[PDB]
Automatic annotation (TrEMBL), chains A, B:
It holds the Pfam family Cas_Cmr5. It comes from Bacteroides fragilis. SUPFAM superfamilies: AF1862-like. The keyword NAD does not apply. GO terms for biological process: defense response to virus. Belongs to the CRISPR system Cmr5 family. This is CRISPR type III-B/RAMP module-associated protein Cmr5.
From TrEMBL, chains C, D, E:
The lineage of its organism: Bacteria, Pseudomonadati, Bacteroidota, Bacteroidia, Bacteroidales. It comes from the Bacteria. It comes from Bacteroides fragilis. NCBIfam families: cas_RAMP_Cmr4. InterPro entries: CRISPR-assoc_RAMP_Cmr4, RAMP_III_fam. Pfam families: RAMPs (PF03787). Keywords: Antiviral defense. This is Type III-B CRISPR module RAMP protein Cmr4.
Amino acid sequence: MKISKKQIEYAIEALRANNIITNDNQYPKVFKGYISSFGAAVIQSGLIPAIIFFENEDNDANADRHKIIGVLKDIINAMRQQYTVTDATILVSSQIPANYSMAQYIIEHGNTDQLLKEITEAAVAMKLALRMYKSE
Amino acid sequence: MKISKKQIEYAIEALRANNIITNDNQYPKVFKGYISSFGAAVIQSGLIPAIIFFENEDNDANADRHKIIGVLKDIINAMRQQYTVTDATILVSSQIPANYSMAQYIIEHGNTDQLLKEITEAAVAMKLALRMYKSE
Amino acid sequence: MTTRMYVINTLSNMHVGSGEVNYGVIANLIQRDSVTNLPNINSSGLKGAIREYFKENEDLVRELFGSAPRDEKTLPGKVRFFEANLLSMPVRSDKVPFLMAISDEVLQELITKMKFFNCEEATQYISHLSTLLDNIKTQAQGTDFAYVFDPLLQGAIIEEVSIRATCPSHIPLQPSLKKLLGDRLVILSHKYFSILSDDNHLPVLSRNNLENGQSANLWYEQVLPRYSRLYFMLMDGNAQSEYLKKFRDTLCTPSTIIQIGANASIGYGYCQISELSPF
Amino acid sequence: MTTRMYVINTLSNMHVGSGEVNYGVIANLIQRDSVTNLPNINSSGLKGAIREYFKENEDLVRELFGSAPRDEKTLPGKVRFFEANLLSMPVRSDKVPFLMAISDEVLQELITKMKFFNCEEATQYISHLSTLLDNIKTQAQGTDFAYVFDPLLQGAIIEEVSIRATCPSHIPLQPSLKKLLGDRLVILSHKYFSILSDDNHLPVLSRNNLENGQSANLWYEQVLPRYSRLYFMLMDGNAQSEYLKKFRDTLCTPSTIIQIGANASIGYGYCQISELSPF
Amino acid sequence: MTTRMYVINTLSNMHVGSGEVNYGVIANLIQRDSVTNLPNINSSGLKGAIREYFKENEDLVRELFGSAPRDEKTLPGKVRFFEANLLSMPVRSDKVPFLMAISDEVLQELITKMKFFNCEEATQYISHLSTLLDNIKTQAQGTDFAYVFDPLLQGAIIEEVSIRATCPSHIPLQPSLKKLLGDRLVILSHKYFSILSDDNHLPVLSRNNLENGQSANLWYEQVLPRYSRLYFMLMDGNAQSEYLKKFRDTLCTPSTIIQIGANASIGYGYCQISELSPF
């Protein structure tokens, strides 16, 4: 899997839009581990368990972990916005609702390989985008 | 290809300027592996992910890996300085700002075929120029 | 006589590294076929491992594999080693611990390879495999399928809730095909097998580096699951008969175990090589 | 009975070295065509491989190929060999394991070459290929395209060039064109095929030399994907008809496998030569 | 019945050997003009190739080309062959596989040659080529230029010398000029053409001599790229009208291919001689 530069652009705007990256191009140092752990959880336990774990808002974590799931949703929406007409016949090009829970969206849409592939690519893009900035 | 002497000279000057080679013609050992791995990473992954990985500061590495990205930027700047300014030419001669990370420049300056060619040539020049010196 | 098909049965989790940089979860990926994107062994790696096994017999290695690197007399090797392609992969289930999974495209590729290379005992295998593939295509009628040939494995979940096993009573499985492909065989569609063999579904092993009991490094390694079957082609390039006989005898001896791939010291790539049994 | 066209179907990865010193990542680059930059085989290597296959029949080699390099008397070769230009390449896909990739410029070059050389069965193939190319250009309307002709292959993604194929229903692909260009055929724009066949997207393999377990050397090799299709032209001069018939029968026999290129001992460059079938 | 212009239009790689003492890596170099260093064919080679093609027609060879070297009596040939200068060469492009590269200096040299030789259809070609050259000079205004005439070819990239193709909309390329210079024509400065046609940019091929798998010799060869166009002048003196007409008709026949160059058996230097069509 090769990460495109447009995916990294989407990741940068999504990390700024949620609030991972501050106005001085800095981020809390724990989001690096958050994204790495999300990738590991997706590869090991599965898409749904990892999404449920990192989507939870009533955490004991130092920072807001659910913002990485928000960044995921924004990156996936940006990726789907550029889907071609012939892609929309095979792939689902509908936009994920902003207030919708990502885990329940995945569950209602099944467990299709499209969603898992998009999540993995977006997680790698998030990791690469964080690698471009300073850890506080 | 064939070895470009001017690019080797640019590589020598950039290696000296980016504090790779000490006052004595000696460099830390791991930089050989850094330079060699950069081209393979560029080919196997994308150019953007490789530049992100090598430009990343605050990493856990035996030395300053971002110095090779600095050397690459200096060599590319020298090449663009020497570029012939004529109409009906493809190459863009504008220098890369010193306040700019290479990743950001490649991100907002796409259609990067020229940038890819320059980066590969600069990596080859760096690899061949590093052999004039000794590893501690 | 010239061309023989050998089956590789792995006894541990095998890793033949592709050596490429992956900036995702898995730092070390395995070799994949350039065309079919399925896990494979490069013929160079197979030849190197087998040469390492036979290194003691200097005359046999010199005649069969060729001269050692940087020897004064460079003589070419006579036996030609072809790359090993994935035949069967174990898949986790709920009715049995694991099942032998092969796709229709893998079967078609095997049939085409046997047709092109003209293996020793290829005629009966091609006939029966073509009959099985035709029956499978007739039963499927263009849809996704997961066909088991044991009635007790009906409704088994093949590693994914979507993939469920159905037993077509009409399609027979010959005992020699069962021996070649593996017990508890399931025939999967190309989509199902590709999903079950992609980078998000292949087994990964987590490793860390400890310094004074404290973790310094951490990475994930992709592995080919234990008891996986791969087939490769051995061509007898006019090699001497007695050395060839010794080679095939040692290679096919049940006591012989060969290490292929990376991480030899931690017991990764240990395999058994079997010849294509007559039908 | 002159200047007929032969098709090369590769049974494994092919490496025909260019012999140029590349100081980048890929030290061993494959041979590429002078004008179109597509992978190719020089007629020198083709003649060498075919002579090596036929070297047992001394009289046939002497009549058709010429004389041995250290023979006291010299004899010119009577058969004219031509360079093998790439026709179809396999590309990764999601709905099928791979697709057969050809470009409109490749088809134009093939039509022009057949017109110039006037192959044995050239007329019908030229007419039908011109019709297919005209239909493709009519449907494309100057835009980038990726056209498949099996209705089941609609929406198949080329993995390297992330473009999904469309099915132009009104463009017919004849069975003889299917036999020539290959099954599961996708016709792309020139840019898509150039990106697919460039050095960055051709399969590159990592190799090393081990001395007592530790790596002594390391280099990167690029190869032509297995099942790639290449075509060359063969002109017979004042050659005897009996030797020519023997040569054509042996060369086009389904049991005949020719090794072209490097790395013969690790199964590289094994292919089958087929003649242009009558339309 | 006078001086006539002929175009060569090589259909393959061409290697006409100089026999010069090489100082570099390329052992076999191609013939080049002494003054302009452009690739050329000596008139002796042209006469030899054309006589070889017509050798079966004994009367035509005796009348036009003269007596055989062993003939007991010597007859001077009535036809005078001149040098074959390079007209156009294919250069690597991005929007298209290649473009036919011509320079202003070679166009001026061609105009001077037609004026000096007074070819059959010289006048109209001289007038139209002079108008085209004057328009090119008016548009360039002392700057380095690269002009395409197909509107789709605007923005094309010549790979070796990194320059871009511009489209002057007020410079019409007449159909006969296209037929003479080639399709997808690029007119650029002679410095670019000289760089493209120099020793470092002409295709260089590595060649081998293998004895029982051992390499005996190694050398590198220089070739003229396929689809390159060369022009020469043929002076008939005053030959028999029947033999001259037979010669012209056989030369202009689309099915007639002439071998000029060294490596005949591996298909080097097969061409199609054309005549200067009326404008």
